[PDB]
Design an enzyme around this catalytic site. Structure first.
Site, PDB file in Angstrom:
ATOM      1  N   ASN A  47      -5.032  -8.159  -3.292  1.00 32.23           N
ATOM      2  CA  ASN A  47      -5.112  -6.734  -3.704  1.00 32.23           C
ATOM      3  C   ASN A  47      -3.932  -5.979  -3.984  1.00 32.23           C
ATOM      4  O   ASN A  47      -3.008  -6.605  -4.357  1.00 32.23           O
ATOM      5  CB  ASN A  47      -5.342  -6.157  -2.296  1.00 32.23           C
ATOM      6  CG  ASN A  47      -4.538  -6.481  -1.217  1.00 32.23           C
ATOM      7  OD1 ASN A  47      -3.603  -6.492  -1.646  1.00 32.23           O
ATOM      8  ND2 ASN A  47      -5.064  -7.077  -0.407  1.00 32.23           N
TER       9      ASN A  47
ATOM     10  N   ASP B 280       0.594  -1.226  -0.216  1.00 31.42           N
ATOM     11  CA  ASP B 280      -0.154   0.417   0.311  1.00 31.42           C
ATOM     12  C   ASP B 280       0.353   0.970   0.273  1.00 31.42           C
ATOM     13  O   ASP B 280       0.867   2.276   0.602  1.00 31.42           O
ATOM     14  CB  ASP B 280      -0.416   0.012   1.233  1.00 31.42           C
ATOM     15  CG  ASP B 280      -1.784  -1.203   1.118  1.00 31.42           C
ATOM     16  OD1 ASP B 280      -2.130  -1.886   0.214  1.00 31.42           O
ATOM     17  OD2 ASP B 280      -2.011  -1.608   2.920  1.00 31.42           O
TER      18      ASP B 280
ATOM     19  N   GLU C 162     -10.904   0.413  -3.165  1.00 27.58           N
ATOM     20  CA  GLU C 162     -10.312   0.678  -1.849  1.00 27.58           C
ATOM     21  C   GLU C 162      -9.079   1.430  -2.835  1.00 27.58           C
ATOM     22  O   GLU C 162      -9.324   2.087  -4.211  1.00 27.58           O
ATOM     23  CB  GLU C 162      -9.923  -0.019  -0.835  1.00 27.58           C
ATOM     24  CG  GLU C 162      -9.489  -1.418  -1.616  1.00 27.58           C
ATOM     25  CD  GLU C 162      -8.781  -2.904  -0.865  1.00 27.58           C
ATOM     26  OE1 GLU C 162      -9.250  -2.674  -0.080  1.00 27.58           O
ATOM     27  OE2 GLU C 162      -7.972  -3.395  -1.286  1.00 27.58           O
TER      28      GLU C 162
HETATM   29 CA   LIG Z   1      -3.463   4.843  -0.586  1.00 27.82          CA
END
Ligand SMILES: [Ca+2]
Length: 299
Positions: free
Chosen positions: A240, A13, A185
């Site tokens: 993801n 991330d 997301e």
């Molecule tokens: Ca981010």
């Protein structure tokens, strides 16, 4: 250049900022897998940096939610901003509020000054939301000096954006709603040549999550879908996908993650990711060409 760029600890991330000639990348620190693990274990944020896109320096974990906040337990999916000659690191407390941590140094220590989340379920304009994941901040400072936090998860209409004060540790007004096809997301905003680019990770409804995007002449309205920035990277196990877009020394890059380190070591890849970087290019009309993941280092 190397691939993977950083394997000391698992990272996911990413978000990136340029400061004093270096590119700094901040990541969810995926803790080494534990027996019984069936969800994330991201207690802290890792930072690495470079001045040459070849040698990456490990700055360790620069924020730990339990140590460095009074209210949060976890620190998922950082967003970094350099403003006011300070560094603001926004993070998700696992869906239980979004925080902000501050430092005068890119490498911390970062400390959250607030008694509670910067943005919570009770922030005006968040609710009603059905099934929203109140997480994954993406902060942006516009030309007019207005900062915005984009956030949310789990649905087309489950994006929110709220103004931040110039001190970057307060909100101004109410959140408003945005919509993007198949939004899941990883909300992210950047501006280039007069256009606003809302990029995000899509859901699993027509295959695996991709990094997709919209463009507008305005920061919070007027968006139209434009396509895919990043497909599933190699060695990602149909899981993801999370990115940031950043300009460094006149070129553009997408930072993202995959699971190549775990794959090479035969480890459980679900919660043991590693950061990646690739070059990004614009078309003449301002759309973004789909990124081509590479596996032999930046060219
Ligand atoms: Ca981010």
């Amino acid at each position: 250049a190397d691939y993977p760029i950083f394997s000391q600890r698992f990272t996911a991330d990413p978000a990136a900022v340029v400061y004093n000639g270096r590119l700094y990348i901040y990541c969810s620190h995926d803790s080494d897998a534990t027996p019984g693990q069936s969800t994330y274990n991201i207690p802290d944020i890792t930072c690495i940096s470079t001045d040459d896109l070849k040698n990456w320096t490990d700055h360790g974990e620069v924020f730990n939610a339990k140590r460095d906040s009074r209210w949060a337990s976890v620190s998922w999916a950082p967003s970094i901003v350099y403003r006011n000659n300070k560094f603001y690191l926004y993070y998700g407390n696992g869906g239980n509020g979004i925080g902000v941590a501050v430092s005068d140094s890119p490498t911390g220590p970062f400390k959250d000054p607030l008694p509670g989340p910067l943005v919570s379920w009770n922030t005006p304009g968040v609710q009603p939301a059905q099934n929203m994941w109140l997480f994954d901040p993406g902060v942006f400072v516009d030309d007019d000096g207005q900062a915005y936090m984009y956030f949310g998860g789990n649905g087309q209409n489950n994006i929110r954006v709220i103004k931040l004060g110039n001190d970057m540790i307060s909100t101004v007004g109410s959140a408003m709603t945005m919509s993007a096809p198949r939004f899941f997301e990883a909300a992210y905003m950047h501006k280039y040549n007069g256009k606003y680019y809302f990029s995000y990770a899509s859901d699993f409804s027509q295959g695996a999550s991709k990094i997709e995007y919209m463009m507008s002449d305005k920061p919070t309205t007027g968006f139209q879908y434009k396509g895919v920035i990043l497909p599933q990277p190699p060695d990602n196990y149909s899981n993801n996908n999370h990115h940031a877009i950043v300009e460094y020394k006149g070129n553009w890059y997408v930072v993202y993650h995959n699971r190549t380190v775990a794959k090479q070591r035969g480890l459980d890849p679900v919660y043991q990711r590693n950061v990646c970087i690739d070059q990004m290019f614009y078309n003449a009309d301002g759309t973004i060409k789909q990124v081509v993941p590479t596996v032999d280092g930046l060219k």
